[PDB]
């Protein structure tokens, strides 16, 4: 390997990207799914104070 040891050689399926995952009309599965949440933008910075979000 020279740098580390000996993996023989490390290719990538002929070509990396465009084989499946690619910015084109031919997308795979996954992406945009039930994960994470949109909170807000509310900074609430009134001068140098905010409020109390109770009840």
């Amino acid at each position: 390997g020279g740098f580390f040891k000996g993996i023989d050689a490390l290719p990538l399926t002929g070509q990396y990207t465009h084989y499946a995952l690619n910015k084109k009309t031919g997308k795979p599965d996954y992406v945009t799914d039930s994960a994470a949440s949109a909170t807000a933008w509310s900074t609430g910075v009134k001068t140098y104070n905010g409020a109390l979000g109770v009840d």
Binding site: G1, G2, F3, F4, K5, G6, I7, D8, A9, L10, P11, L12, T13, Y16, T17, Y19, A20, L21, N22, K23, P28, D29, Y30, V31, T32, D33, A35, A36, S37, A38, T39, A40, W41
Partner: protein, 155 residues
Amino acid sequence: MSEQNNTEMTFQIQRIYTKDISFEAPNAPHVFQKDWQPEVKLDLDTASSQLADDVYEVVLRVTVTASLGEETAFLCEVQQGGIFSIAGIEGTQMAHCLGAYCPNILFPYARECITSMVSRGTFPQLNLAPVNFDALFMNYLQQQAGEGTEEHQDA
């Protein structure tokens, strides 16, 4: 020597970094008329280079499209590249580690670099969903199978 009783494979990061940043708020002064979290959409793209045998350099380019109403809010794009040491493994899992697992290391760093630029435009809170880069290539090479035998390799 890869022929003894030891921990399977050896992996070692060398250096992680941002190659490229872009943040365009095209309707910036006026798009602030829209007070809500914009319609976000994640779009991934990837490029690589072999610097060595046993050591590969991969780049996860992440792009977030965000738009308030019918006008674009922001377009944020990071390229998180990194030199990693992938050794010990063989077959499919060898180049799978640099091709899939290493972009997944780079994704958090790309993610915070995005949310930094969003915060600079002072747009709503953008947390990207946990997207496994492997998953898309894994479903494309799913029809194959390969239930191995219980026998561990070494580093």
